[PDB]
């Protein structure tokens, strides 16, 4: 749903990136993230990209999924959404998780 | 905005790196004694057919039971045992397990990966 550039299969709300409001939506083939109100993703991620998912779990106020890219790079996604936030992380982890095989290589 | 973002150091990172369709690797285990569950009875999950093991309890399976049943009796479990002094959750249990008075189901495992349910109520406790 949400095909306003891509086919997003999972959709979370109240995410931040850096001091940035916004919300996470993964689409097909990639992560891409955009800030409450705006019509455009600021950030989206392919999975090839994307090296490795960090995930901060409860015990801290602040739920965050971190993709450390290739180069070293990284996306600080805080899940800010009081009632799910760690459960979002999650949701998404497992998704982006599985989503980035899809762009890794085969068996050969 | 919120600069919470960058206001710490040391995020719990719960490391997760994908790892799907992984070998099994039957020789990556360690035990291979009767490693057996203590439930709560109540729910009373049990197979349907002949038990093969013996409705006994030695020290391994009582001594599980009694450290399981202090803990509950602890968090202020009551006593389904009669009490001559028995204040300690240790000593409550011991009579409760001597007497199979303790609810709980102990579902016994062997090596080649066979599992067994046996209630304290089917055990024979050999103190």
Known sequence: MATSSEEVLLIVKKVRQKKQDGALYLMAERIAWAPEGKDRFTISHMYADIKCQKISPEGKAKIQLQLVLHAGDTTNFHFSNESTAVKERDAVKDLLQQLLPKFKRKAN | ?127
């Open chain 2, 1 to 127: 905005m919120s600069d919470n973002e960058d206001n710490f150091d040391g995020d719990d990172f719960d490391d997760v790196e994908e790892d799907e369709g992984l070998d099994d690797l039957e020789n990556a285990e360690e035990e291979g004694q009767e490693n057996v569950e203590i439930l709560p009875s109540g729910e009373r999950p049990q197979a349907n057919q002949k038990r093969i093991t013996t409705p006994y309890m030695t020290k391994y399976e009582r001594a599980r039971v009694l450290g399981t049943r202090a803990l509950q009796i602890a968090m202020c479990a009551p006593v389904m045992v009669e009490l001559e002094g028995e204040t300690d959750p240790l000593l409550i249990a011991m009579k409760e397990l001597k007497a199979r008075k303790i609810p709980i189901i102990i579902r016994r495992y062997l090596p080649d990966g066979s599992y067994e349910d046996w209630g304290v109520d089917e055990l024979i406790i050999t103190d």
